[PDB]
Structures are given as C-alpha cells and as structure tokens.
C-alpha cells in the first residue's frame, strides 16, 4: 500500500508554493477528462474521500481543442455563477459527443439551455472575477508544468500518474487513485 516516486506520482520539477492542496487539470476536449469526469467518476471519489478541509481547486486547460480558450473563460463563468455541476454534462456533451458546440455563441447558449440566466452569463463573462479566474487558470497551467490532462497535482509538489494506478476494474482504479492522493496529502 505504500507508493513510489515514478510509479503512481512523479516530483514536480519546480513546486509550487502557496496551492490548493489537490488541483485538478482538465479540458472539455479530452476523451480521458470525459470518462474521468462523466462516466467513471474518479474526481469525484477523490473529492469524496480526501481529509474533511482539503483545499481544492478544478482548472481548465487552453491547450486541447479550436475553442480552448473560450472554454477556459466559461468554465471561469461556471465557477463564477456556482453552477459547474449543473453545465458540465451539457458541455462534455457538446464538445465530444453531439460535436455541436463550435463558437463563442454555442458556447453561450449551452449556459442558457442548461438552465443558466442569459443576463447572469453575458454580465459574469466581461466580470473582474472572471477576468482573474482566466488569469489563475492560465497561470496555473504554467506554473505547474501540465502538459496533458486529466491531471491532479497534491500539494504543489506531486502529479498523479494515470498510468500507473495498480487496478483491474474501474471502481478499483477510482479507489487507489483516492488512495494515492490521501497519502500524497499525509506527505
């Protein structure tokens, strides 16, 4: 039960100070997010199951897909108007799935036809407060050296390895991934 540098996590080169303590990287683009996400549900077994107080944070990355970008600034927006479980299905959906999200408008009525205030959205979208979750997102992407998705990062210091979780099913790969990041924590 006892983990190892370069086989469930690796160093990151230049930690980072002052972070969440489990932040977690993923694009709207990515099959490997969508079935993290949406079908087997390992961010949510970690979520779950780390230490009551774990301070935790869920960024989206520019780097995958036309409309990057512009699905960082609405992910900004869902965290913004608190209502990142509400879209999220619906934009998985149309990014990967229906493949009929593909501008900035799309995007816009995905928010509306999933329930979101037109007038919350367009005010919220030009918003300080989104303005400086773009930069945070951007920034941490950076600061973090993440160069695919899905990724968590433990305490500034250490990167959960996707292929390297030991498990023969599913539910047992959510498991000892949640398994991993608590004693990544205890670190």
């Not at 960082?72 to 009929?100: H, M």
């Not at 400086?132 to 305490?155: C, H």
Request: charged share 20%; with cysteine.
């Amino acid at each position: 039960a006892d983990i190892s540098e370069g086989k469930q996590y690796t160093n990151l080169s230049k930690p980072v100070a002052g972070a969440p303590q489990v932040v977690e990287f993923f694009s709207f683009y990515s099959p490997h997010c969508y079935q993290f996400s949406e079908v087997y549900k390992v961010n949510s077994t970690v979520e779950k199951n780390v230490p009551e107080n774990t301070k935790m944070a869920r960024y989206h990355v520019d780097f995958l897909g036309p409309l990057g970008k512009e699905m960082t600034r609405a992910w900004a927006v869902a965290i913004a108007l608190g209502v990142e479980d509400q879209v999220s299905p619906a934009l998985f959906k149309g990014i990967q799935e229906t493949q009929s999200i593909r501008s900035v408008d799309d995007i816009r009525t995905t928010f509306i036809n999933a329930g979101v205030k037109a007038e919350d959205y367009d005010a919220a979208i030009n918003s300080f407060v989104v303005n400086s979750l773009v930069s945070q997102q951007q920034n941490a992407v950076t600061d973090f050296q993440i160069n695919g998705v899905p990724a968590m990062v433990i305490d500034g210091k250490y990167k959960m390895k996707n292929d390297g979780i030991s498990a023969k099913s599913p539910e047992e790969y959510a498991k000892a991934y949640s398994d991993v990041v608590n004693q990544l924590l205890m670190k």
